[PDB]
C-alpha cells in the first residue's frame, strides 16, 4: 500500500527540519528508518544546534506510525563511527534500500576571499565530505542486498548558482552535485539510482533565525520573518518567500519510490523557480 | 483520495502511447480529462499513425475509472480548432488545472544539412509550434480559474543533447525547453507551474517500429526489438533498454499534483541516466 | 600573420551591427568574406531595418583591408536563393572555412500566450530555421574542401534563460543551441567545429531604439539610452549596461581561429555575467 | 603589441605542463609572471612529481622572452606561505592583473565508496581548497590595483560530468565550478572577471604515465600511448586522442586578455566535444 512499503531508509541529519520530515514521510509510506544526527553543538553555527531530545522526538513520530526506527548520535565527519551506527542499524532492520544524505549546516557569511581557513574547512567537512561519508557508509548494504536502491543527496540552489557571501557553502553544494553524478555513473549498473534535491529557502531553523534575518534586512534592528519574507520572495518565480520541509520530503519520496525507478543522475530543484532567474 | 482529486487535465496526443497513459494515470488519481489527438496520418511518419478508434479507447479507459472525459479530433497545428476544442471541454467540465503538451512525432532521420525543407518544417510545426499552441489554448482557462495550476511539456533527452541524424527533432525539443522556461517565468506570478519531462526511449509506437530498428541496427536484415535493445541500452546508465509510458506518467503525475506545488522551471529527465554520459 | 589568414568566412546579417563587425574583424585577421543580408524591411520589426547601402559599407570596410568580399542581398528564409548566393561566392573565393550564422531579429514583445501566430512564425522562420538554412547552405563547401572548419551560431542569453514578454525569441534561441549541438555531433568526425555565442544586450540598432527604451522604462515618456542603461545594467554581474559588437567579434574570432582548434559543442556567453543571476 | 602587454599574471602549478605553458604563452603576449609550484612529492601521486629544476626551466623560458618572473616553491595547501610568496612577487613586479589557479593532481582511481579517507582528503585539499587558497592569496592585489582583472580556474570535463573510478576528482572539480561562480558574483562589481577552463585529456605528465594507460587499457600488458589513444579518442567528438597544453593556454590567453573584457562566469570546455556525449 505505502509507496516505499517493505523498504529501509538511512537518513542523516534526522533530528529535526527536513531530515525529520523525510523520516516521517518515508515512514508514512511504509519504510523503516535508520536516523542519525550529531545532536550537539557545531563550530560557528549561526543558529541553535540540535539536541538528543530532537532525535528522540523524530523516533516517537516514526514509532507512532507503527514503523521501526534505529537512532544514533553520530557526526557524519567521523566515518568509522558512522559506519558502525549504519552497520548496526542494518543488522537490526535486515536491509538497506534508500539513503538520504541530508545533514548539513550554514555558517558564517563573509566575502569568499575573507572566509577563514577553519570556517571554510568545517563547511567542506560537513556539507561535502560528510555527504560522501554518508553514502559510503550505506552503499555496501544496498549492493549486498541485491535489490537495487535509491540514493538522494541534499544539495541546494547554491549547488548550481552563487549568492554573495556564501561561497564556502556554494563550493560544497556544487561538490555534492559531482558526488551525485559520480555515484550515479558507478552504481547505475547495479540498478542503484542516485539523484540530488536542490532546495531554495526552507522554513527550518537553518533559515528562521536572527542571523539570517539580519543579513537579509540590514536596514532593520530587530528584523523578523515578516521582514525577511519579501527579500527572500524576490529570489523566486512563484510568489512565496520559502518552501516547507514537506515540499522537500515529497520530492525525496518521489525519488525514493518505484515511481522513479528509471530516474537517475538528476538534479531536482524544489526552488519556487529560483533557478529561472 | 486521489492525488489530483477535483482537477481537470488537458492532454494533447492522447490517442495512444504516453498521452493515453497520462490520461489514465491522472484519471486514476481523480482528474477529469480533456483529450485531443489528430487521429490521422502525418506526412513522412516513420510508423503507423493514430486512429479515431485509439482515442475512443482512451475515453473508454478513463470512463471505466468513473471519471469524465471530453475528446476531440484536432491537429495541434490548427490553433483555432484546438482553442475551440479546449473551450468546449472546459465549458463541459467547469475548470482547467493541468495541461500536458505531449503530442509529437518522430520522422525521417538524415544528416542535418540534408534534411528537406518540408521535413524540417513539419517537425518544427508539430513538435515546437504545436506545443506553444497547446499551452496558449489552455492557459486562459487556468488563469481565469484563479486557483493556480501546473503545465508539463514533453521534451526529450534530445532537448538537452544531440544524437546523429535527428537534428530537426533536436532543434524542436530544445525549443520546447525554451517554451517551458518562458512560460514558467511569465505564469509563475499567477502560481502556475511550468516544467518539462525529458524521456529517453519509451516503449511506444514511435520507437517500436521497423524504421527505428534499422536506424539503430543497419547490420541486421529484419531487426526486431531484441536486436534494438542492446544498442538502446548502451545509451543508458541503468541496464534497461527503454522506459515505459507509465514511467513518464508517474513523473507527470508528480509534477501535476500538489506534492510539487513549488516545483517550477525544471527539466525532469526520465532517462535511465542517458544525460550522465 | 593574421589569426585566420588564408581562410574564407560566410557571414549572415552582415549589413551592420555584429555581422558587419564580424566581417571587418575576420578580414583584419586575414579572411576573405561572403557577406549576405536581407537589406530590406521585415514584418513587425521594432526598429529601423537595414539597407543596401549598409551592406555596401561593410564591403568598403573589408576592401579597405585589402581583402576580398562577395556580397548578396538575400533573405535567409529563402534557402534556394541563399544556397545560390553562397555557391557563387565560394566559386569566386575558392573555399569555405568559417560560417557565422548571425542574422536575426527582435520583434513584438507580448505575453507568450498572447503572441500572434504570424509573429511567432516569422520569429521561428528567421531566428531558428534561417540559422539552419545558413549552415545548410555553407557546410557542403566546408566538407568538400576537406580542411576542417569552424561554424559559429549566434544564440543569446535568451537561449539559456527566459525574460518576460520575449518568449518566441526565447524559443527560437534555445532551438539555436540544439542546432549547434546537432551540427557539432554530426560534423565533428570531419574536424568541423560548431559553437554558439550568447550575447547579452549589444549596442546595436536591435537594442538602441525607441521601442526597446520604452519597454525597459515604462515610467518615462521619451526614454533614451541614458534611462535604459541602469535597468539593463541590473541584469549584469559586471557594472556595464551592454556589450559592444567588437566584444562579440572577439569571441567569434577566437572560435574561428586555430587557437580554438579543439573547442566544439560550446555555448560561449558574452554576457557581462547575466547567466550568473 | 602583446595581448596582455603591461600585465602581471600569477600562476599556480607552473613548474611544467599546462602551468608552464600558461606562463610562457602569457609572457609571449607581454605579461610578467609570478609562478609557484610545490616542486616536490605528493602522497599517492600516480606519476612523477615535479622538481625545483622544472620551475627554474619555466623561469628560463620566460626570461628568454625578455619578461620578468618571480618563482617560489610553495604548496597551495599552505595558505600563509602562498600569500607570502604572492605578496613578495607583487612587491617586486608592482601589480597583479591575472590569476590562473592551475595547480592540481590526479591520484588513485577506485570506486567512490572504496576510496580511503586520506586519499579523498588530499584530493579535496589540493584540487578544491588549494584553488580557493590561490584566488584568496591573489585577489587583494588585483582589488587594490583598481584596474579590474581576470581570474581563470582550471576545472576539468570532470567538473561537469563523471567518469567511473575518479569520484574524488569529480567532486573536487565540481567544487571548482562553484568557486568560479561565487568569485565571479562577488568580484564582478569590481570589474574582475572569473571563468573556468574545462580540459579533456591533455598530453601532460598527469595523463602520459603507465598508471593511466592501465586504468584505460586493462587488456594490455605494458600499454603505451598508442594503445591508450583509441580509448581516449572514443570520449571525443573531434577525432583526436587528447589536446595539448597549448590549447589550454590559448583559451587562458583569451580569457586573460581585454578581448574577453565582458566575459565572466563562464565554464569554457577545451574538450574536443567530450561534453556533447
Ligand atoms: N534550509 C534551507 O534553506 C536550505 C537551503 C538549501 C539547502 N539546505 C540543506 O538542507 C539540509 C537540511 O537542513 P535543514 O533545512 O533541515 O536544517 P536543520 O539545521 O534544521 O537540520 C540539519 C540537521 O543536520 C544535522 N547535522 C549538521 N551537521 C551534522 C554533522 N556533522 N553530523 C551529523 N548531523 C549533522 C543538524 O544537527 C540538524 O539536525 C542541509 O543539507 C542544508 O544545507 C537547506
Ligand atoms: N517515444 C520515445 O522514445 C520518445 C522519446 C523522447 C520523447 N518522446 C515524446 O513523447 C511524446 C509522446 O510520444 P509517444 O512515445 O506517446 O508516441 P505516439 O506516436 O504513440 O504518441 C504521440 C501521439 O501524438 C499525436 N500527434 C502527433 N502529431 C499530432 C498533431 N499534429 N496534432 C495532434 N496530435 C498529434 C499522435 O497521433 C500520437 O497519438 C512526444 O512528444 C514524443 O516526441 C518520445
Ligand atoms: N543586439 C542584442 O542585444 C542581441 C542579444 C542577443 C542576441 N542578439 C543576436 O545578435 C545577432 C545580430 O543582431 P545585431 O545586434 O547585429 O542586430 P542588427 O539588427 O543591427 O543586425 C542584424 C542583421 O541581420 C539581418 N537580417 C535579419 N533578418 C534577416 C533575414 N531574414 N535574412 C537576411 N538577413 C537578415 C538584418 O537586416 C540586420 O542587418 C542576431 O541573431 C540577434 O538576435 C542580439
Ligand atoms: N592532464 C589532464 O588530462 C587534465 C584533465 C583535466 C584537468 N586537468 C587539470 O589541469 C591542471 C594542470 O595539470 P597538468 O595537466 O599541467 O599536469 P602536471 O602534473 O604536469 O602539472 C600540474 C602541476 O601542479 C603542481 N601541483 C600539484 N599539487 C600542488 C600543490 N599542492 N601545490 C603546488 N603545486 C602543486 C604539480 O607539481 C605540477 O607541476 C590541473 O588542475 C589538472 O587537474 C588536467
Numbering used by the authors:
A (entry chain A), B (entry chain B), C (entry chain A), D (entry chain B): 10 to 286
What sentences appear in the manuscript?
Here we present a series of TIGR03971 SDR crystal structures from several mycobacterial species which contain an insertion in the primary sequence at the NAD cofactor binding site. These crystal structures demonstrate that the inserted protein residues almost completely cover the NAD cofactor, only leaving part of the nicotinamide ring exposed to solvent. NMR experiments did not show exchange of the NAD cofactor, whereas binding was demonstrated for a number of small molecules which could be potential substrates, products, inhibitors, or artificial redox partners.
With the exception of the M. thermoresistibile target which did not contain NAD, all other mycobacterial SDR target crystal structures contained NAD, which appears to have co-purified with the protein after expression in E. coli. For each of these crystal structures, the adenosine mononucleotide portion of the cofactor binding site is enveloped by the inserted residues and only a portion of the nicotinamide ring appears open to solvent (see representative examples in Fig. 2A and B). The combination of the insertion loop which covers the adenosine portion of the cofactor and the ordering of the second loop which covers the nicotinamide mononucleotide portion of the cofactor results in a significant decrease in the solvent accessible surface area of the cofactor in the mycobacterial SDRs, relative to other NAD- and NADP-dependent dehydrogenases. Only a small portion of the nicotinamide ring appears available to solvent in each of these cases, indicating that the NAD cofactor is tightly bound and potentially non-exchangeable. To test whether or not the bound NAD was exchangeable, we performed a number of line broadening and STD-NMR ligand-observe studies, and did not observe exchange of NAD/NADH during the timescale of the NMR experiments.
